[PDB]
Structure formats: C-alpha cells, structure tokens
C-alpha cells in the first residue's frame, strides 16, 4: 500500500512533554512488608480546554540602504476595519530609539488594505495577510489551550497569554486573574464574526474578547464557563503492582509504569469528599475487571481497595492481593495459632513474610534494573532521533525536538502520495560537486493547492528546506523511502522506482540465510587522477567521530 | 584465545538488505475472533543462482600537463589474445568529444602485453593486470548472482547485467529476455579456458558467453538450465502466532516475527497445485514438531493446517490451537447447548470469545509495543554502527554501510593474528601535533603474500586507509583491542600489550563492586604555558554535539 | 525532592573497566547433555588494598620572551624541610639540553617557602602548594591502590609505581619485587607526620616509605603485611544456569551473566586444598538458598555440587538439576529397564535426552540472541554517553570516558543545591551572536569554600569549563534540569524556575493521551532581513550528520 507522506513543521514549544529518567535501585531487598496487588493510578485531571484564538499583528520594516519589528493591531482596527470591512489600516505605530513612530506602507499615504488568504489550501490555521518600507497586516486563527487553573492559556505560537480564557466583564467570568491592565483588554458584546475567506458574516452574535500584547494582538470568543468535572482521571490501569514499606513510607513499583511512587502509609479519606462517588466506580470497576481477567483463578482479594496520595500528585487506588500458594501458608499458620480474614493476618507472621520479601524483592529489583536499562537506552535514542521516538510513544506520526532537557511535540500535516512528485535529478546546477544528499520533491497540501518545493526526509517525511547538501562524490548508489516503496538513484540521477517487496527484508532479528557475495571495490579510475572523493554512504558513528577530527585539524591549519 | 582479525572492504551494493520499520499498534483490542496457533511462514523461493563471472576492461588515461576513462575489451581480443596467448592488446578504443579515438600505451607502437596476477595471496577474486598515456588491461574473476526471474544477474562490482545468465544461442536457453542486441553478445562453443596464473589450457571444453557493456566486457560459462525446484522456502518456524480478524481480513502476529501479516480470510487451494506435496510435508512435519515440543501437554489441535497468502508474498501455514483451559469452556458450553469438533465450536460462543479476545488482545498489543520499542532502538543503532548490527543479525562478521534508507552487505576477509603486526608508534612524522587516533598495522593476507599497510579498527577490524587522524594531545592513555587482548599506548607511543583478563570486565549488566577511587587530574604543566589541548578520550555524544558548535562559530569568524 | 548536584572530574584511567562484547550463538542446538542447574561463579579474589599515598613535585617554568617541566622533590627536602619545618626549598634541579640545571624561584636567592592548602574546602585529596621563573612546590595526598600480586600500585593520577606497596627493609616486607634501585627509594623509621593544615605533628611514630620517579616523588606509610584471605570471591549468584557439553568441553550459559564459560569436562579437586572449606560454606550455603527460594517446589537436586575452572579464571560451583516433569521420565525409564540415583541415570537414556536437548537448546540460544541484542545496544550506548551508562552499571553517579576500547571510571563530588546558583543570563558579552548553549552556574563545594565558576551539565551535572558555546540564535526557548526541577530560559535570558511536576511526563513507554495542538511557526521577522539563524533546539542525529556535511563544503570553498 502507498503510505501517506508527512510534512512535519518544527514545534514551537506549546506542548513540552518531559520524559522520565533512571532511578537508584536497591542493592538488596530491604523494603519490609512486601505484597502484590492491582492498582489504578489516577493523574490530576488537568482538564485541557482547547479553543481557536486569533492573533493580529503588523510587520514593520525599513528599506534604507535595516530595522524590522512587529507591532500589534489596535482594538478599533480589529472591530471596525477588519471585523466589519475586512481590511487593514495601511499605517501602523511602532517604537524606535525609545520613541513612538508611525509607519507608512511603501512610503504611501493612509489607505485601506484588503486581507487575503495566505494559502489556497484548506488548513486549520487559516491565516491572512495584506502583502506577500513595508507594513504587512497579518491575521491568523491559531489554536490555543488552557489547563485546570485556567489562569493562562498558550497559543499555537508557544507564547503564553497571562490571562484566563474565561476572563471577561460579564457575570460568571474568571475575573480572579488578569496580568494585563484594563487598557490592554476589551470585551465586545453582540459581536458578529465574518470569515474573510467567504465574507458572509455570522448568523448569530457571540461576545468576543480582545487582548493586546507588546508584540501582537489576540482575540477569542468568550465562553461563559466550562462546568466542573471530576478532579481525577484514570492515567494507567496497572495490571501488576507491588507495595513495599520502607523508611516510614510505602513504595509502589510495577513493570509497565517505570516509576516508583512514595506515600505516607495512610490512606486518603476519599469517603469525606465527593470524589468517593466518581473514583468509587471508576477505580473499583476497573479493579474487578483486571482481577477477573487474570487473577480470578490464581489470587485472592485482600481487604477493600486502598487509596494513597503518592508523591508528585498521583493517586493510587491499590488493591492488595496474594497468590493462592501464599494463602495456604497464612491459613495454615492461622490454624496453628488458633490451636479467616487475610486483611489482618497479612504481615503478622514474620517467618512467612521473610521469604516472600526476598521473592518479591528480586522481582521489584529486576523491574528497576531492566527499566533503567530501557530508560537510559530510550533517553539516548530520544537525543538521537526525537521524531521516531516521539511518534512511537504517542502512537502516531508527530514532530518533536529537544528544547534543552525537555521535548517539544506538535502534530504533522499528512499529504497523499498522489500530490508528491520526486524530481528526476538531485544534482545542483549552482554548485558543481556540492549537490544534495536526498532527493528533491515538489508537492501540494491538497489537489487545489499550489505546488510547493521541498525535500524528501526520513520515513516518507517531507522537509520544506532544501538545505541537506553535501560534497557529493562519484560512484553514488542510494535508495530512499518514497511512499510504499523506494526510489533508487545512481550518480545523483533518478534511475527508477521499486516497490517495498523488491528488496530482501531482514524482518526477524536473526536472519542468517542472506545470499551474500564478496563485493569487489570497483571504483572509477577518476579517483586516482582527479582525486575526487568516492561514495561512502551515510556516515558511520565512528565516521562522524572521525570527520570532525579532520575538521579540527583543518581549523588548526588555519590558526597556524 | 587469539581471535582472528578481519579486513572488511566497503560493500558495493550487490546485496541490499532493507530492514523492518515500526507499526501502528492498536490502542485497544479491536480484532475479533482471536485465537492462538502454530505457523510456518514461507517466502517465495527466490533460488539464488551463484556463479563466477569474469570482467574485462582497459583503463585509458592521458598524461597531458587530465582525461581518464574506462573502455571494454572486444570479443576477438578475449577469445584470441587473452584466452589463447594470455596477453592484452596494447592499443584500445575510447571516445572523446563525441568522437571515437584510439589510445596507445605510453605513446608506444602496438605490442602484446602479458597479464600478471594483481596479488600473491590466494583470493576468490583472482584479478589480473598488465600495468601496475597508460592503457592498463584488466581481467577479474568477480562473483555473480541471479534470482527467480533469471532475467538479470548482478556482479560483485554491483553493476547489473540486463540479460539472463542462461541466455544463449543453444537449445534450452533463456532467450525470452536480453536487453542487449546481438552485436553486443556472443557465445563460443568448444571454448577452452586457461588460468592466466598457470597457462593450463582446459582439458574439457565448455561453452562460454560474452557480453560487452558501455564500460566493460563480461564473460561466464553457460550452464544449460538449472532444474525447477519448489516455489516456497521455509523462512521462519513460528513457535507462537496469534490470528486476529479485523476489517474483513485476518491479522497474524507473533513475538519473534516483528511484523503483522494480512490475508483475505480465505485459504489458498494448495491441493490444486503440485506445491501441495512440497509444502504438505515441509509444513505439516514442522507443525507436529513444534506442537510435540511445547504444546502437546497444554494445547489441543483445532482443524487441519490452513494456508493463507499474506500481503507481501508470504504464505502462512497456520494451525489453529487453544489452551486446555479454554477447551473446558468450549466443551462445557457445548454440553449446555446440547441439552465433539472444536473446529466448528470455535468463535460460536460470543460470551466465551469476548474474554479471550481481551486476554490475547493484550498479548498481541504487548508484542507490538515491545517490538516497536526494539525496532526503533535497533534502527537507530543501524545508523550508528551498521557493521556491528549487520554482523550480529547475519550471525557472522560482516561489512555493511547504509546506501540511503537501505543497508548494503558484503563479507569480510579473515586474516590470522600471526600475520598482523602493530607498529611501535602512532606519531606522524609529517605533521607535528596531528598524529593518528588508532594504532597503525602492517599485515599480509597470506603467509607468502606481501606486507600491506593498514590501520587498526574496532573489534579487531583492519582498515586499509590510514586516514583516522586527529589533533593529537598530551597525556594520552588509551587501550585498543588487538587479537585476544589489548594494546596499551601512552603519549601516542606503543607501551605494551596486555591480555583480555588483565582488565576488570563488567560481564553482568549490574556490577557495583568496582574498586573505584577518586581520580586526580595530574595534567602536564605544558597545558598552561604551551596552551596545547589535553587528552579527552573518545568524544562523548554531547561532546560531538558540542565540538561542531565550535566549528560553526569558527566559520562565523571566517564569514565576518 | 531537590536532588544534589554533581561535579564529575575527568577520570585519569586509574580504574579501567572493559565491558563484554557479542558472541557467536549456535545456528541450531548442537550441544549434547544440556542440563539445568544452580551455579555460583567465583572470581579470583583480587583483594584491592587501598591506601592514601602522598606525591611531592615542583613545577619549573621559564619566563623568557617557553621551557617548562616537572621535577621531583629530594628525600632530604621531604623528611627535613617539608616534614619538620613544613616548608619547601625555593631552588630546584631540572634537566635541560640533556644537562642537569638548577632553577630559582622568581629569579630570587635560596629561601624557604611555606606550603599552604590548595583549597579551603575539605577534600579527600587535600593538596598543598607554595605558589598560586617559577618553582611551585606541590604536595598532594592522592589515593592509591594495589592488587593480589602486590608488585605494583596505581596512584589516583593513573601513573603506575613499579614497586610493591609493602616493600621495605624491615622484616616481613615484599622485597621480592622493586623496579627502582636503592638510590631512588628510602624507608624512614620512627617517622612523625604533621598535617600541613594544622602543623599538628604525630604522637605515635610510624615508618614511612619514599620513592622518587623521573617526574615526581611519592611517599606512603608502610604497613607490615595484609594477612592472607580466601583466594576466591563470590562474583555472581546465578539463579538459573544451563550446562552444555560440546567439543570435549562443557558450556555454561545463563540469562543474567551475558557470557558463556568453557571448562575441561573435569571437576577441580577443591577438597585437596584449604579452599574446599572456605568455598565449601560460601557456595553450598548459597546453593541451598537459591534452591530453597524457587527450585524446592519444582526441581530435584542431582548429585553433589560440582566445581569447574572455566576459561578466563572463573570458578563455577555448578549444581545440576532437572524439573520434576523430567524426573518422572527418568524414573519411568529406570523402572522399564529394571524389568534411584539421578546422578547416574542422567544422560543415560538418549531418547529422553534428545528432546530436552532441543528444549533447553532453544532457551540457551534465545538468551544468546537477546543478550547479543542488548550487548550491542548497550555497547553503542556506552560510546554515545558513557556517563549515564557508567552510572547505571555501577549503581551510583560516576564519571567515565572512553580511553579507546576501554572505559575509565572514577567517582564524582556531590554538592548540595543550596550552594549552587544559576546565573540570570547566558548571553556572552565578549562575543555577540555566539552566546553559551547551557546555563552558567557559580557554586562552592562547601559553605565555607570559595565560589568557583562553572557550567550546568546534563542531569544536574556541574562542569568546570564554560566551553559549551554555540552560534546562538533568536526565538530560543529551552528547559534545563536544575535540582529537583527545571530552569526555563528564553532569548538566552533567565525567565523563571519551575518544578518537576510542572511538565507533562511520559513515564509509561506508551502515553498517547497528550493534549497536543498544531504548533504554528511564529518566527521573528528579522530572520528574513538580518538573515540570522532561528532556534532549532538540540541537533538531531540527522542534523549532526547534515551540519558536518556543510563543514566539508565550507572547507571545499576554502580549498578552492
Ligand atoms: C506526608 O506527611 C507530611 C507531614 O505531614 C507532609 O508534609 C507536610 O505537608 C504540608 C502540606 O500538605 C506542609 O504544610 C505547608 O508547609 C509550608 C511550611 O512548611 C507552607 O507552605 C504552608 O503553610 C503549609 O503549612 C507541611 O509543612 C509538611 N510538613 C512536613 C513535616 O514536611 C507531606 O506532604 C505528606 N506527603 C504526602 C505524599 O502525602
Ligand atoms: C484479496 O482479494 C482482492 C480482490 O480479489 C485482491 O485484489 C485483486 O488482485 C488482483 C490480482 O490478484 C487484481 O487484478 C489485477 O489488477 C490490475 C487492475 O486493477 C491489473 O494489473 C490486472 O489486469 C489484474 O486484473 C485486482 O485488480 C485486485 N482487485 C482489487 C479490488 O483490488 C487482492 O490481491 C487479494 N489479496 C490477497 C493478499 O490475497
Ligand atoms: C584444559 O586442559 C588443557 C590440557 O591439559 C590445559 O592446557 C594446558 O595448560 C597448562 C597450564 O595449565 C600448560 O602448561 C604450561 O604451558 C606452557 C608451555 O606450553 C608453559 O608456560 C608452562 O611450562 C606449562 O607447561 C599446557 O601447555 C597446556 N596444554 C595444552 C595442550 O594446551 C588447559 O589449560 C585446560 N583448561 C582449563 C580451562 O582448565
Ligand atoms: C509491617 O506490618 C506490620 C503489621 O501491620 C506492622 O506492625 C504493626 O505496626 C503497627 C503500626 O504501624 C502497630 O500498631 C502494630 O502493633 C504492629 N503489629 C501488628 C501485629 O499489627 C509493621 O510495623 C510493619 N513493618 C514495617 C517495617 O513497617
Ligand atoms: C467470527 O467467526 C464467526 C464464526 O465463523 C463468524 O460468524 C459466521 O460467519 C459465517 C461466514 O463466515 C456465517 O455463515 C455464519 O452464520 C456466522 N455465524 C456463525 C455462528 O457461524 C464471524 O463473522 C466472525 N467475526 C468477524 C468479526 O469476522
Ligand atoms: C553424555 O554423558 C554420558 C554419560 O556420562 C556420556 O556417556 C559415557 O561416556 C563415558 C566416557 O566419557 C563412557 O565411559 C560411558 O560408558 C558412557 N556412558 C555412560 C552411561 O556413562 C557421553 O559421552 C556424554 N556425551 C557427550 C556427547 O559428551
Ligand atoms: C471467578 O472464580 C469463581 C470461583 O471459581 C467463579 O465462580 C467465577 O465464575 C469466576 N469468574 C470468571 C469471570 O472467570
Ligand atoms: C538456509 O536455511 C536453511 C533452512 O531453510 C538452512 O538449513 C541453511 O543452513 C541456511 N543457509 C545458511 C547459509 O545459513
Ligand atoms: C503427547 O501427549 C499424548 C497424550 O498425553 C501422549 O500419548 C504422547 O506420548 C505425547 N507425546 C510426546 C512426544 O510427548
Ligand atoms: C562487594 O560485594 C559484596 C558481596 O560479595 C557486598 O557485600 C559488598 O557490599 C560489595 N561492595 C560494594 C562496594 O558494593
Ligand atoms: C521443600 O519441599 C519439601 C517437600 O515438599 C518440604 O518438606 C520443605 O518444607 C520445603 N522447604 C521449603 C524451605 O519450602
Ligand atoms: C484519553 O484517555 C481516555 C481514557 O482515559 C480515552 O478514552 C481517550 O481515547 C484518550 N484520548 C486519546 C486521544 O487517545
């Protein structure tokens, strides 16, 4: 099948997903009162409120012989020139040398400028502009999001707006927080919106909020208030979890969680709050579902479900258990002492608790050791190729990059293969011997959209920048993934296209039945006379670690 | 033990091995009619036909003050001058400025040139040449291979010959395909071959084929026709496979396959073809072998073996099964409804099928999750060090590099440690402060062969190019693997050799009993006065990610 | 919790830890007699003798317009000027032009110089010096270590001293080995030590040894002799090990060992030496502990413990076992042949041994396959980030680097977060457009210690060199780990600090519930006019593999 191509834009940081790090596993099993049981960890219900905002700004530039800046759009212009007439004021106000100054579009007098779409293809971020000195008025319907505090919201651009999205002068608004004074905010009633693409005007009115930042103006529809919801959300249904008591604090460890939770040895009184009814059915029902799936025929339930507030804000709805084999030991000792309630007999018999502590202790330590093995390997992989790691973790193709020690993540735009065309030659005509490293591509986001240039990335990815150039060599032979197959190139010229089934795939880790042959180093004779480099394929880790050494030597030759 | 050294040449791409990529694992178990069973996936019997070909070409060059090219050897020269007299014509024909031109050897008149071996050590690719203007006639007995279509064959050099290896004017040849006209091909009958190493005219004649390409001439013995064989070959014996029905198509998943197969819900009528007897014994016998190994005491066979043609060309000889615990559920419900044949009772009871769908669903999803986890880690490792990844996958030391999105593979020549000698110093006398990074070595492929220079690579690998230079520091202390031990160097000078047992080994992932001590930086005093860089060992990933940053800054200083 | 920071100094190589490499797993199970049993592998008791030595040297330099070298401190100066008066001789003797020459401190006459601590903060390696021409007398109480041979000891600087630490003229000394003549060594009796920090002086005298090297003088207290101890030390308690006989040699394989051991098919007569009692209690007791933990209810002991001397110096105290299911097969055949002693019945019935050979064979091969998969991934990770890999392997934060094919290991100095202060801006004032890549930090090892400059590393690591510069862009937004949270920077200026819980954590490998949004590329307009690079975050693997390509192209433009 012809897989769809993807054009991943660089994330701006609106969504920064941090990723876990290794732990200090115990050298020997020291935690006392070890036990096994089911658990349903609940995360703080952040309640992400997503809405579509609208930014307004004007890019000012100077063409002398140098100075370029961005300015916001005043409220009267948004509500009258843009909202009603669908045009932008030619002039704009900015600051130069700490002095306010007025700007004129292409040294022309004040006139109205019509806003037109930035791209013909349909996109979530519609976008508009007046120009393709220069004062380009820009309007963009970017996305936005808020969280449980609802005190601030982040736009798609990544900049944070220090004001509640529900803020407003109407009743029931989030007036409790606003970092900007009244002169920088305004709310309009009976506001009618009109899409600049169609210009048909809204059918009914809806109050709209407006905010002016030092660099741009923002606006968004004002919803009254999202009704309250349960403060806890099921994060992960732990199929197997072990509780360990050490240092006056419980320690919950599991195989699929990759993290140890610490509590205070006391159950949270969930019955004293309304959450006892919300989580009372979300956790208890899940507990029985997990128990009836694999523990009904091998374990026995011990006591009622226990809720613990772990460090970091997580709530664990633990359910202690014990294997049937261990149950026989407890009942036998109970009969011996009697010469049944496992909730009380648990941990009472020290001679019975000591062996299980080591048995479960090794398992807990084993998980910690292997988890650290995967975490460190996974962490290094993130720094290597965050796109592949981010895509597999989120379950879908996604764009990502390292913003220091945290990962910024943002969805990619899929484009059908019918609109992607690979150029017949990757040789650059403006620089002999310095042609591109990957095939060039020309595509369009949609059938009616224009043809935008680009470059072929890794795993059907499309890059908007054709900057992947290299001192291109002689004897070049490379295969690049293109759709549901590969595009073969030779001597930096398109040779032909082949399907995915035309190449021997080593699918299983071990496949030693390869019909190999001793390759002969048939290199062109120009390598000995013209002294031009020969093809070496994608650089090896030791090669990049070696090429940079030559670079340092080259710099040394210059410093000398 | 003194392990053998290896000299891995760069593969030319004759054998390209694409490698699996991650999948879209289901978020929840949605596939219906889940079941467990044995399976023997069959790949199309490509039938690789390997034979030794022989290339003939002449390297033409000009000595003005510039122009070099390769030309083929005409047929009359191969069959008369080279085959009988064992000599090459001094003159050759090429093309310049779109005009055919003749070339003379060292501006001398036409004469006969004897072909001599290119190397003394016995190698599979024997090779011969006349010279060590200049017209060097070359003859090489490179390897070749063909596949199922038999319409083309690839030489060891990597270039493809668009003609069937069995092609010829004789009866029973593969005349159905040939991309070259009759003027470029010729077949000789009663041809006698004589090895230029011994001039031993053949004792028994064998017809020989000949082809002339735009760059070189090829020749090879013509075999009549390889007899037909079974069209399917056992690719992998799946010890545990799960079949899932979804979207009107089955889905076969396993733990060791790392790939999901899709079919058309209908068994291929294998009994209608001769393959029913070939696979009827190769698959059925393997099915019983796997079942009698681990499933005889815990599972029961359900129905006869089922053959399905999966997407991509694979044929899966599935054998549905079910655990004995699940069998009790089916028979119990059968007796309830009756108030036996599991092939008909399977999937009939929805209440019994629902829990197993979730049970096996997690297992299927678990395999997909971990497989994707390993695939990306493995794929990232391939781009890091394909030699180690290619060697472990194929089960033997192997050369490899990435030709874009596909990996080229070729064997390595093993050389005994007795013939490898490490130089007593890595300091370069032609460049102060810029000495090599790894030890230099001098070796010979054969005991009687000449001593060829080289450099020490990673894991006893021998590199023919001594280009691993770096700005060499002071206070250098490094260990390099050499044979069955290590070669210790100090201040870029050979210090001594130590065995593998002379260094503390971390054989178990976790080994915290290391007798460490707080190292003190006893850097030489010349670092503060001479300002020379101090030893830093092999560059850390963050260091290579930091050193390049300095390069751009250095370039910025130049662009200023 | 606010984790502690760490300042990791570069290891000098005093402790080198080689790490296992991939193996040649069998293609099919060929080993005969595969059995399953417990084992306790013993390593040679290296007996690391750690002691604190003391180096004495003087750094000589010339201030003309160039010549610098290090010289040792004579014995009379150490025992009289430094030991008694606590001062160093201003003059020193060095070699120049192959001629001994005298050096004076700052072209002054002969005078006494007082030794003062190098750092006010308390450290294990105290250190002292006279100066902060120039003759700086230095005294450092570095660490040292010796091993089983006790013929040589290595200092914290990594330099080896070819003399036994127990060497001396007194009775019971290790006079059997000394690579330095009498003129380079001296032992003082009744020596009184006085700490230069407090000129306290000794109350109880202790003999002190002294040795002079070509570059420095060493001294250390002479202990009579460490009494002998058991020659074997428990290295790893194997919970599951399989023995396989092949090629006239046993082959031991396990899951957690990652290495196959080869023996000579004959048990070592441990009862003939005293080790039969030391290991007789250490191995047998451990064997019963492992057996009583998991194998008591499923396996049966076969024969007495067997000790084998494996290749590499390891001793394996194997204990053959067999599952109860296999026991029934043996006893059943025994009864059939009778028409019990498992030690003699084992391997006697070939028909019973053949199936178990394949069963255990796949398990042994499976471990070898997965172990090789992890080894290469782990080895490739070591070359990427040895610090993270070294820390997890040793169980604690540790400094490490690659000294070629071996890894150097050393500890790190922990510093509390209270003494670490992050600078409010990472912008370099001496180089516009080339500001640092990571936040700068100022800290002190202790409260009373001085404030030393530094840079923030990865995972709370503190680097002493502020050389992590890069061409700093615009639109920069990065998060760096700092203590128990993150430090957010924008436009290379300190914005604010946030806790670890303020960022969404992807803890479980699969977390697809991310409240993602399509980020919009809001880039400053100066990118189009000033042509200044935009923020790209930490370089991707494909980016470093691409940025370096531009470097070669840039050099090609210089070479042109
Ligand atoms: C486990 O129990 C301990 C002890 O009760 C908890 O620590 C306590 O946490 C409370 C808040 O829940 C802290 O109160 C606050 O502290 C500071 C002043 O220290 C101030 O911001 C507020 O006015 C308020 O009083 C309290 O100080 C703290 N006590 C101690 C001794 O640490 C801890 O949170 C519990 N942990 C879990 C995971 O439940
Ligand atoms: C599952 O069944 C479907 C439907 O029968 C199979 O798709 C069909 O595959 C045949 C070849 O086996 C296609 O016929 C060929 O198609 C093209 C024109 O479309 C042309 O090259 C030939 O003249 C020939 O007719 C057929 O079009 C195609 N039908 C559809 C609807 O896709 C499919 O291959 C089966 N898959 C498996 C894994 O068995
Ligand atoms: C397995 O058995 C073989 C054969 O007995 C052992 O090899 C032998 O090892 C001894 C030392 O234990 C070698 O003796 C020494 O050899 C050299 C001269 O070759 C010299 O240094 C000494 O004078 C001494 O004689 C002996 O040569 C060697 N024999 C052979 C045939 O290689 C082997 O060590 C045993 N392996 C294990 C793991 O126990
Ligand atoms: C392990 O659990 C036992 C049983 O719950 C704990 O012993 C009890 O501790 C409570 C206080 O936590 C006392 O009131 C009881 O008298 C103790 N005994 C019994 C029989 O309940 C024990 O403290 C736990 N061990 C550790 C190390 O935390
Ligand atoms: C799961 O398997 C059942 C049983 O084979 C399928 O239901 C039968 O489908 C056949 C045609 O394939 C019909 O003739 C039968 O009447 C169906 N019912 C029974 C009781 O046999 C069912 O379609 C499969 N489920 C899915 C989702 O594909
Ligand atoms: C597997 O073990 C059996 C039993 O120890 C070995 O068979 C014995 O071999 C010895 C010599 O090594 C003979 O003296 C005995 O007569 C053999 N039989 C018995 C019952 O002890 C057998 O050699 C081993 N197999 C392999 C392949 O090493
Ligand atoms: C759980 O086990 C009980 C006791 O054997 C049994 O009655 C019940 O049906 C089982 N439930 C499931 C869902 O298997
Ligand atoms: C190819 O596979 C077959 C089994 O299908 C096996 O017997 C043979 O050894 C394999 N070839 C190689 C070279 O490993
Ligand atoms: C398989 O199981 C059957 C039924 O118990 C038994 O008769 C037969 O011997 C078993 N075969 C093997 C190879 O274990
Ligand atoms: C060394 O190993 C022993 C067991 O053999 C253990 O008790 C000890 O703690 C270990 N030492 C260190 C420093 O980890
Ligand atoms: C080991 O098993 C035996 C036999 O069932 C039993 O008597 C003994 O108590 C068990 N020992 C332990 C420590 O579980
Ligand atoms: C978020 O999690 C809920 C269950 O808590 C699930 O129903 C929903 O599909 C998840 N969202 C996504 C986008 O996967």
Author numbering:
A (entry chain C), B (entry chain A), C (entry chain B): 109 to 173, 185 to 251, 267 to 473, 501 to 721
What does the paper say about this structure?
Lastly, we introduced cysteine pairs into the interfaces between domains DI and DIV and between domains DI and DV to further stabilize the configuration of these mobile domains in the prefusion conformation. Of the nine tested potential disulfide (DS)-containing constructs, only A240C+E607C expressed. Most of the 3.0-Å-resolved cryo-EM reconstruction of prefusion gB closely resembled the structure modelled using cryo-electron tomography, with the primary structural differences occurring at domain boundaries, such as between residues 501 and 510 at the amino (N)-terminal portion of DIII, where the prefusion structure assumed a random coil that wrapped around the extended C-terminal helix of DII, instead of an extended helix. For prefusion DI, the fusion loops (174–184 and 252–266) should be associated with the viral membrane, but were disordered and not visible in the reconstruction map of the prefusion ectodomain. For prefusion DII, residues 462–473 formed a helix that extended outward from the rest of the domain and pointed away from the viral membrane, but reoriented approximately 90° to form a compacted DII in postfusion gB. Thus, domains DI–DIV each transitioned between pre- and postfusion primarily en bloc, with substantial structural rearrangements occurring only in DV. All visualized glycans were in the top half of the trimer, and a per-atom quantification of glycan shielding revealed much of the trimer apex to be covered or proximal to N-linked glycan. The prefusion conformational stability of gB-Ecto.H516P.L531E.DS enabled us to assess the immunogenicity of the soluble prefusion gB ectodomain.
